[PDB]
Every structure is written in structure tokens, then in C-alpha cells.
Motif scaffolding. Sequence first.
Motif, PDB file in Angstrom:
ATOM      1  N   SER A   1       0.651  -1.038   0.058  1.00 54.01           N
ATOM      2  CA  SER A   1       0.163  -0.059   0.045  1.00 54.01           C
ATOM      3  C   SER A   1       0.990   1.114   0.108  1.00 54.01           C
ATOM      4  O   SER A   1       0.646   2.067  -0.763  1.00 54.01           O
ATOM      5  CB  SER A   1      -0.905   0.124   1.252  1.00 54.01           C
ATOM      6  N   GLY A   2       1.800   1.224   0.772  1.00 54.95           N
ATOM      7  CA  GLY A   2       2.962   2.551   0.980  1.00 54.95           C
ATOM      8  C   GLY A   2       3.723   2.292   1.973  1.00 54.95           C
ATOM      9  O   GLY A   2       3.652   1.716   3.203  1.00 54.95           O
ATOM     10  N   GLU A   3       4.973   2.929   1.976  1.00 50.86           N
ATOM     11  CA  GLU A   3       5.924   2.970   2.991  1.00 50.86           C
ATOM     12  C   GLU A   3       6.100   4.275   3.593  1.00 50.86           C
ATOM     13  O   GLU A   3       7.395   4.367   4.049  1.00 50.86           O
ATOM     14  CB  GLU A   3       7.073   2.310   2.233  1.00 50.86           C
ATOM     15  N   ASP A   4       5.355   5.147   3.355  1.00 51.35           N
ATOM     16  CA  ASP A   4       5.399   6.683   3.940  1.00 51.35           C
ATOM     17  C   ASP A   4       6.752   7.187   3.722  1.00 51.35           C
ATOM     18  O   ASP A   4       7.345   7.902   4.590  1.00 51.35           O
ATOM     19  CB  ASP A   4       4.711   6.605   5.265  1.00 51.35           C
ATOM     20  N   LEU A   5       7.531   6.682   2.628  1.00 49.94           N
ATOM     21  CA  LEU A   5       8.702   7.252   2.275  1.00 49.94           C
ATOM     22  C   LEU A   5       8.928   8.774   2.682  1.00 49.94           C
ATOM     23  O   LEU A   5       7.907   9.659   2.547  1.00 49.94           O
ATOM     24  CB  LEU A   5       9.202   6.763   0.904  1.00 49.94           C
ATOM     25  N   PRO A   6      10.102   9.090   2.995  1.00 52.18           N
ATOM     26  CA  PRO A   6      10.427  10.408   2.975  1.00 52.18           C
ATOM     27  C   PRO A   6      10.057  11.436   1.838  1.00 52.18           C
ATOM     28  O   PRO A   6      11.244  11.641   0.832  1.00 52.18           O
ATOM     29  CB  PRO A   6      11.947  10.529   3.606  1.00 52.18           C
TER      30      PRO A   6
ATOM     31  N   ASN B   1       6.774  21.016  -7.598  1.00 48.76           N
ATOM     32  CA  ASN B   1       7.852  21.570  -8.445  1.00 48.76           C
ATOM     33  C   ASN B   1       7.488  21.466 -10.032  1.00 48.76           C
ATOM     34  O   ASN B   1       7.848  22.076 -10.768  1.00 48.76           O
ATOM     35  CB  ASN B   1       9.022  20.769  -7.893  1.00 48.76           C
ATOM     36  N   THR B   2       6.557  20.334 -10.309  1.00 51.98           N
ATOM     37  CA  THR B   2       6.281  19.981 -11.607  1.00 51.98           C
ATOM     38  C   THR B   2       4.721  20.269 -11.750  1.00 51.98           C
ATOM     39  O   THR B   2       4.277  20.218 -12.841  1.00 51.98           O
ATOM     40  CB  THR B   2       6.694  18.539 -12.049  1.00 51.98           C
ATOM     41  N   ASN B   3       3.924  20.403 -10.783  1.00 48.12           N
ATOM     42  CA  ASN B   3       2.652  20.440 -10.897  1.00 48.12           C
ATOM     43  C   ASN B   3       1.878  19.182 -11.441  1.00 48.12           C
ATOM     44  O   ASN B   3       1.033  19.289 -12.318  1.00 48.12           O
ATOM     45  CB  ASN B   3       2.339  21.843 -11.673  1.00 48.12           C
ATOM     46  N   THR B   4       2.194  18.303 -10.863  1.00 51.03           N
ATOM     47  CA  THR B   4       1.786  17.017 -11.228  1.00 51.03           C
ATOM     48  C   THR B   4       1.518  15.926 -10.171  1.00 51.03           C
ATOM     49  O   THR B   4       2.217  16.130  -8.919  1.00 51.03           O
ATOM     50  CB  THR B   4       2.767  16.105 -12.351  1.00 51.03           C
ATOM     51  N   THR B   5       0.384  15.049 -10.184  1.00 50.19           N
ATOM     52  CA  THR B   5       0.167  14.302  -9.254  1.00 50.19           C
ATOM     53  C   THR B   5       0.898  12.648  -9.536  1.00 50.19           C
ATOM     54  O   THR B   5       0.595  12.228 -10.937  1.00 50.19           O
ATOM     55  CB  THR B   5      -1.433  14.067  -8.916  1.00 50.19           C
ATOM     56  N   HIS B   6       0.850  11.628  -8.472  1.00 54.54           N
ATOM     57  CA  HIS B   6       1.244  10.259  -8.855  1.00 54.54           C
ATOM     58  C   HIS B   6       0.596   9.452  -7.623  1.00 54.54           C
ATOM     59  O   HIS B   6       0.699   9.757  -6.399  1.00 54.54           O
ATOM     60  CB  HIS B   6       2.764  10.286  -8.556  1.00 54.54           C
ATOM     61  N   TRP B   7      -0.087   8.579  -8.232  1.00 57.33           N
ATOM     62  CA  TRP B   7      -0.786   7.492  -7.324  1.00 57.33           C
ATOM     63  C   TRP B   7       0.382   6.812  -6.274  1.00 57.33           C
ATOM     64  O   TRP B   7       0.028   6.770  -5.188  1.00 57.33           O
ATOM     65  CB  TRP B   7      -1.313   6.558  -8.084  1.00 57.33           C
ATOM     66  N   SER B   8       1.193   6.493  -6.858  1.00 58.12           N
ATOM     67  CA  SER B   8       2.697   5.912  -6.157  1.00 58.12           C
ATOM     68  C   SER B   8       3.678   6.744  -6.131  1.00 58.12           C
ATOM     69  O   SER B   8       3.789   7.871  -6.460  1.00 58.12           O
ATOM     70  CB  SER B   8       2.904   4.690  -7.184  1.00 58.12           C
ATOM     71  N   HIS B   9       4.380   6.470  -4.974  1.00 59.97           N
ATOM     72  CA  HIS B   9       5.413   7.444  -4.217  1.00 59.97           C
ATOM     73  C   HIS B   9       6.510   7.800  -5.502  1.00 59.97           C
ATOM     74  O   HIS B   9       6.747   6.852  -6.402  1.00 59.97           O
ATOM     75  CB  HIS B   9       6.025   6.636  -3.217  1.00 59.97           C
ATOM     76  N   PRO B  10       6.795   8.883  -5.605  1.00 56.48           N
ATOM     77  CA  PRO B  10       7.812   9.355  -6.636  1.00 56.48           C
ATOM     78  C   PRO B  10       9.161   8.773  -6.476  1.00 56.48           C
ATOM     79  O   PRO B  10       9.889   8.646  -7.306  1.00 56.48           O
ATOM     80  CB  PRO B  10       7.671  10.970  -6.288  1.00 56.48           C
ATOM     81  N   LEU B  11       9.505   8.035  -5.054  1.00 58.90           N
ATOM     82  CA  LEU B  11      10.818   7.535  -4.916  1.00 58.90           C
ATOM     83  C   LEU B  11      10.655   6.003  -5.140  1.00 58.90           C
ATOM     84  O   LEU B  11      11.550   5.473  -5.576  1.00 58.90           O
ATOM     85  CB  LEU B  11      11.202   7.897  -3.678  1.00 58.90           C
ATOM     86  N   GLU B  12       9.489   5.306  -4.993  1.00 56.97           N
ATOM     87  CA  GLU B  12       9.200   4.097  -5.159  1.00 56.97           C
ATOM     88  C   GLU B  12       9.554   3.628  -6.760  1.00 56.97           C
ATOM     89  O   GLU B  12      10.457   2.945  -6.814  1.00 56.97           O
ATOM     90  CB  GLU B  12       7.953   3.699  -5.037  1.00 56.97           C
ATOM     91  N   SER B  13       8.996   4.188  -7.620  1.00 53.54           N
ATOM     92  CA  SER B  13       9.242   3.913  -9.026  1.00 53.54           C
ATOM     93  C   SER B  13      10.324   4.881  -9.509  1.00 53.54           C
ATOM     94  O   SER B  13      10.234   6.058  -9.800  1.00 53.54           O
ATOM     95  CB  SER B  13       7.871   4.179  -9.547  1.00 53.54           C
TER      96      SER B  13
END
Length: 49
Positions: free
Chosen positions: A6-11, A32-44
Amino acid sequence: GSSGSSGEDLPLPPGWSVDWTMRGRKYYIDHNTNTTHWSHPLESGPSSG
């Protein structure tokens, strides 16, 4: 173990902000880019460090 990846509440990085919608979904917003992401930006493919 883990519910289900589900998620790792990454930093989250500087400029991002997570928020839960009415339904109950967790989405990350990028100021910064004005975009949304369902999954963490660091995960993928983080490509941070």
C-alpha cells in the motif's frame, strides 16, 4: 506481513505533498512540476541519489 504494498510513507522530497481524497485514496502532489502520482515518486524510479 505488509497489508499489500500500500505504501511505505517514504520521506517525500522537498516540494511534494500527500493528501487523501474523499473516497480514501492516498495521492502525492508535486508542486515542483505541478503533477500528481498515485504511487510514491521515490518508489518507482527515484533517481534522487
